[PDB]
Amino acid sequence: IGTGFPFDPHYVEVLGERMHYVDVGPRDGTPVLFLHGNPTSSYLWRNIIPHVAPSHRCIAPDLIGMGKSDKPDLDYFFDDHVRYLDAFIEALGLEEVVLVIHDWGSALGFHWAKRNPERVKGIACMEFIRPIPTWDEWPEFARELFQAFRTADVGRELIIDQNAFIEQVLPKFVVRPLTEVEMDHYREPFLKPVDREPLWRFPNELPIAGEPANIVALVEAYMNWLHQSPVPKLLFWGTPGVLIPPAEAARLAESLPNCKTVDIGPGLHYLQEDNPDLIGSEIARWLPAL
Ligand SMILES: [F-]
């Protein structure tokens, strides 16, 4: 599995801040917009993009405060990310898009799709955010850790001081062993503890047990939209998963209209790190029929 990032950097000004993005592929069709989540960046898509770039433009931004994007003095609530991603999409003058989305990038993508349904031609998704009714629906192997992340003082000490989202959650949520070269890519934006705010705010935004109420409501809303939308959907899943266990992926194959699922094999949360070639090849096979 490749560890390099062989992509020319691009930057665009968004609400007075610079955002980094990958931009490869032909420029005369519907672009494919790749949205990472926590604690990753466009690096997470590095081995998937090459499958799609021969036929389609691939745009992969680094979220505000992440990757090579600028680090404004924000609290980095979900709403902050919504504002910057909305403005990034407009700054590139994108019209219709296909979304490829994961984790908080899926909350962003689904929320954008709900608000701009005529502009979404297809959605490929994996390990995406739904409301989590109770802690029992969070995997036991990561339950105490995420509960700690959401505990006053304790969570900041873990994520801000000890860098636990990078150092603990990444290896925990990839089935295969990650290499040092890969870990160093993921570490690069967060060498300075103060810069880790997004990494801590994100798990504190997860819709778990009805809290925070604003996120639960927003995620319920995009899920009601998704369950009634005719947009083509391609859902990748692994065993045992984290946010989307096998039995749930099988239900969604039916409970989401126009949906196909792809089993990537063993996988936890960062499925892109376990089977990037199957994800990329199957997205490439699915695109032309949109
Ligand atoms: F998170």
From Swiss-Prot:
Induction: By 1-haloalkanes.
Keyword check for Amino-acid biosynthesis: no
Entry keywords, A to Z: Detoxification, Hydrolase, Plasmid
Chain ranges of the AB hydrolase-1 domain: 31-155
Example of a GO biological process term: response to toxic substance
Pathway entry: Xenobiotic degradation; haloalkane degradation
Residues the record marks as active site: D103, E127, H269
A GO molecular function held by the record: haloalkane dehalogenase activity
Gene3D superfamilies in UniProt: alpha/beta hydrolase (3.40.50.1820)
Family recorded in the similarity comment: Belongs to the haloalkane dehalogenase family. Type 2 subfamily.
Protein task: Catalyzes hydrolytic cleavage of carbon-halogen bonds in halogenated aliphatic compounds, leading to the formation of the corresponding primary alcohols, halide ions and protons. Expresses halogenase activity against 1-chloroalkanes of chain length C3 to C10, and also shows a very weak activity with 1,2-dichloroethane.
Protein name: Haloalkane dehalogenase
Gene source species: Rhodococcus rhodochrous
Gene: dhaA
